[PDB]
Amino acid sequence: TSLVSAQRLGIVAVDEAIPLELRSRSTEEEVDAVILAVYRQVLGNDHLMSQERLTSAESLLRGREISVRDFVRAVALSEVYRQKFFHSNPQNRFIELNYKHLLGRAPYDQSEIAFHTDLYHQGGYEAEINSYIDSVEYTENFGDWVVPYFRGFATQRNQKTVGFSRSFQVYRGYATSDRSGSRSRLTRELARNTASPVYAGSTAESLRGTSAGSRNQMYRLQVIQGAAGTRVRRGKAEYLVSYDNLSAKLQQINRQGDTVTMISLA
Amino acid sequence: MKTPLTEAVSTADSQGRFLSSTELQIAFGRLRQANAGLQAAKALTDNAQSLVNGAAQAVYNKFPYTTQTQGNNFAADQRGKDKCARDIGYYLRIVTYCLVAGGTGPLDEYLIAGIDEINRTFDLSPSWYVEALKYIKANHGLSGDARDEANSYLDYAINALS
């Protein structure tokens, strides 16, 4: 997005990112940069140890034996990818990680969760992973030579609006990685076809004045509430409370049977 | 953090008004005290190791059962002695912070709040720490305004513990 929304949302680096294309007759440093970009984006910005590097796959990429898409596929099918994104993760979290790493976006629909779940159950991890890389979406956006990059913050064709909002649930910042087993943030949002408010970068903070307590910190409590007292006006509720009233607010939410969806510093 | 300046701003902010002459006099009083507080902090810091070791020995002398009775809460072994010296060092360091800050705000935020839950949970006698603070009072060697402000924080800790 433009700068004025980008600084607020903390997506300036994503907006100014340039797609990396491995051209013909590329030099050694270009292949090095392409390999580094693939490792950064497919492995979700983890500190990749040299012992976890795919030496044979990057050799084939260097020697023009395979394309960038094939190297992306080799990294995605690698046991390193399995260990940090599949073997200790629930299936819904795993496929949103696949969507972020391979297509650069958040899941659009619960049917996309229904897909890749049956596909896993019928054809294994390899077929399920190949679905993303062989998809029509991967071909027009990245092709055989462009490193995949995150696209959820920009308006795409055949895109649902929720994708942009849901993007901030899967991209938590430039200095973030997908490293810690964790559950998806999009489960209820995808299942019930909703959208969650975006609280990223500086968007989450709210005015404090003299209303915040001793340590001048407000917390936003997003809860799901029903009538258990006073009339409930909305199913969704947001509560801004100081630190000193955080335990009391939590306990009275608990005794009303209200489900807490999120707590963030505001 | 209870300091003259932060509290002056806080009172003014709840009424939503600019800083008047009252807040300026708070700042003037803080300025009058601050140099003495800074030398008090420097003297305590330079003598910190002997003060902490001497305070620990005074507690071990007054309560000999702490150095000879088995149990996690006592200092009969080296692990317990290290914990004790660490606690007294915590006390001394937060007292120097108070001298720098010009109020009991560091002691309240870092040490005083919740200390009684600590001593109960871990069966630590507050009298031990009172004796350590009394040793520090008697041995810091400060004079004048430095001594008065430092003794105020040390007595504040003593009164909280008793």
Place this chain on the structure above:
Amino acid sequence: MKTPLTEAVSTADSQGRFLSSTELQIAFGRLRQANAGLQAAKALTDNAQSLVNGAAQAVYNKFPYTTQTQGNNFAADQRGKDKCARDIGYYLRIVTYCLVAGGTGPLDEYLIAGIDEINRTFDLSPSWYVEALKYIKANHGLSGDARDEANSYLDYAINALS
């Protein structure tokens, strides 16, 4: 009533604790200010009559219509001039009270609170009183801490008015 001593005890009392070194520093600042405040009050008091008359005449010079326009809120007649002199005398006397008290509490409680409703109801412009306060500023002949503290109260009244 905001003064250093009153504010210090009120902060401590709302926290339900004994006075710490923070409140004592507030008292030290009040002690530093007090003598200049008291002799500024004396100097203003001794020069009060000429200051009030000169401030009133200054308002008449800058705002001539207040002496020609017939109306209850104007000083065209003798009673209007008396009301004006009494009002400026109120401002000067309450400023001395602020000087002896050490804070804006006398101005806040006796004059500032509700003065907007006064001026709106009785059709008195705050600009008139601003010029009266400006004359008092320019002609009180105070120096050092006395002038600083007195001008802060006079500027406090002006800032409240405009």
Place this chain on the structure above:
Amino acid sequence: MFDVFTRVVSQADARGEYLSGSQLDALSATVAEGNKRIDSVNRITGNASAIVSNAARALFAEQPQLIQPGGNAYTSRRMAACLRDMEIILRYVTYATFTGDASVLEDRCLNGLRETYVALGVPGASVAAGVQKMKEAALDIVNDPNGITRGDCSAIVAEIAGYFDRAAAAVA
């Protein structure tokens, strides 16, 4: 609430009069005594816990029926409430000493304390006895000559003593 300056201010404002030269010099005499006032407040505050505990222990020694089973200071909660009141009396006496005016002591602590004690059966005379013990332990702490600049604190000691007697009389 009033301090020593605002008390004179309120009296003068009601008469519409500037403070006279005599009143100003009395206030200048008060601020000249200011360091001694700060020392006395500091000395009572630094020994607050010792003052309250020693006075209560002496009080229960001389009045055993307070702590006998069924007495007013018997059970933990009533003992704690007794200890709390002693410390509260002491705190507002220090407040009154700090401001130089007794209004904080009267408005916060003394107005209604007698009525509360009568309503509950708290023996007000025994509370007055405890307050007098706090008095006598605090005046010599203020009057202690060691570790302070020498001078005459008789005026501030008399003023503190008056606050303590006022507290003892409001409850007895």
Place this chain on the structure above:
Amino acid sequence: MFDVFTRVVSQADARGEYLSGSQLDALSATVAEGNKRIDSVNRITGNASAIVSNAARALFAEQPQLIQPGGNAYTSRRMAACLRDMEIILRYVTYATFTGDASVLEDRCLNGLRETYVALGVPGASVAAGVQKMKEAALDIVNDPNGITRGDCSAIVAEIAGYFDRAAAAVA
């Protein structure tokens, strides 16, 4: 919030370390600057209404679209809200100047202000322009040589400038 002393104290406690000699010396240097800091606070406070009013008049004079009908400063309630906002920013700048730390300005005033302005359609750039007007207006008032002991106030002027620029950056 922090002031200039407790900011250094909090960093030390996180490190578990006593303040070094250089930090205590730096704190002594800012104690020696305390009189000048109080003068700056006093001078901005004593001119606060003039600073806000002249800055606001200049802002609408150079940005007439704010006060045209339908503009964000149009209608007396929104015009009053804009003036109040100016006074709020300036007041927290004086708070930060008094304390010697931007924590009060950042935590209590600036945090979430941009979100509020964006959500309301308050143009943060013109709010930043208005804060920039209060900036040199207050800096010239702090630097006015008349009726004060002469001395170099360059450090405190730079610090107040930083608080003003910090507020301007947050709103824009």
Place this chain on the structure above:
Amino acid sequence: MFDVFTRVVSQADARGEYLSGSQLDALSATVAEGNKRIDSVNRITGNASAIVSNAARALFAEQPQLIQPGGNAYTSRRMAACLRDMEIILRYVTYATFTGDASVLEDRCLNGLRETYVALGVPGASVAAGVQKMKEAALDIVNDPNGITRGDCSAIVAEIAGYFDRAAAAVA
């Protein structure tokens, strides 16, 4: 909220100009329609209980899964909440009819309603069907020619139908 008059006023103030003759004449036409508007509001209000209860019975007869054990309208509390919701929708539709603007129905009833129903598992489509049933019953009530001065109420009925469909669209 807004009514028909204040909506035009708010638009004119944002554009900062007097209402033109066409807008004033349009509001005059609205005033002429006012008696029929009051009639329609009164007619729906008088039959409010019948409209809500009959529509609920019709909804549960054609959607038995709502009232089967485990259905979202099963048990007494949830059935009472469902009847309360039908009543709430009808009442705010009458509010919108009375004002002549849809702001009250939107601002106070429909905004967040979809998100409430999804979050608690209320089937919004079934709420929409009940809303459609109340709409046909209420419009039959409004267009009833018995015991009223005959005139053309087509405009107000179309306006009422729009409020009802806005409600049925908002839930699902």
Place this chain on the structure above:
Amino acid sequence: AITTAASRLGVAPYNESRPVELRPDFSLDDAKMVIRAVYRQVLGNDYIMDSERLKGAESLLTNGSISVREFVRTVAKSELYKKKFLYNNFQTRVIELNYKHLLGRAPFSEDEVIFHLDLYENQGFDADIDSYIDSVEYQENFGENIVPYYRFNNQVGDRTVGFTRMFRLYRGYANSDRSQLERSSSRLATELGQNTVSAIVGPSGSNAGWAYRPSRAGNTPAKALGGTVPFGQASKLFRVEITAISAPGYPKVRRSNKAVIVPFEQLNQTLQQINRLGGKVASITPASL
């Protein structure tokens, strides 16, 4: 509810006053109405000068940065609240004022005095205010978006002792809670300590004997211990509270307020005697049977 005696008491203006709720996506009039209601109720109908208005708290409430409950908390924690209700009052009176402002009811028993005084003394005024507002009673009655209001009517967890004490704390619609006869004195210290009640005396408009207040000592007890024996033959005994006794003058009249237990057969004569001394009857309660 209170129907016949609503105007006599000050309950009638609150009978048709609905609770002030800030709905989600509220308008500007809604925010201002909440500000007015909070100022009136939390500050106890004191006039609020413009210099005393909490501009920042109002702005935050208007913006939705804080809720109604958080705004009530900010007002209750303000220096404005503390000058009006904390700094010049015995802490039992502060507790009485907190219950009236933040909960809209009188204290029920001495246990509440114990809890709040202990919490104030151990953790300060701000922590004490939080306990009123984070209480289960506040959440069930007002919640997050409703301005606290006087709870005159009977509720689920009420005690009738609280209903009687409500009129010791509330003295009419045109009354300001700092402009009452007892001034800064605690109204319920004796009453909470002894678990007793006083006969309800209505406000000054509709009740001639409104000014009656018992003295420190020498008060006639509520019930007639002894029955009819000191009065010869009598059917029933009644306690009559009389105020504004002045006609005979000092030394014949010492206290202008007097409570007398009189038999039924002397009630007529008692009324004439009150009329000669210029007194006003505050209340008459059955004292026997």
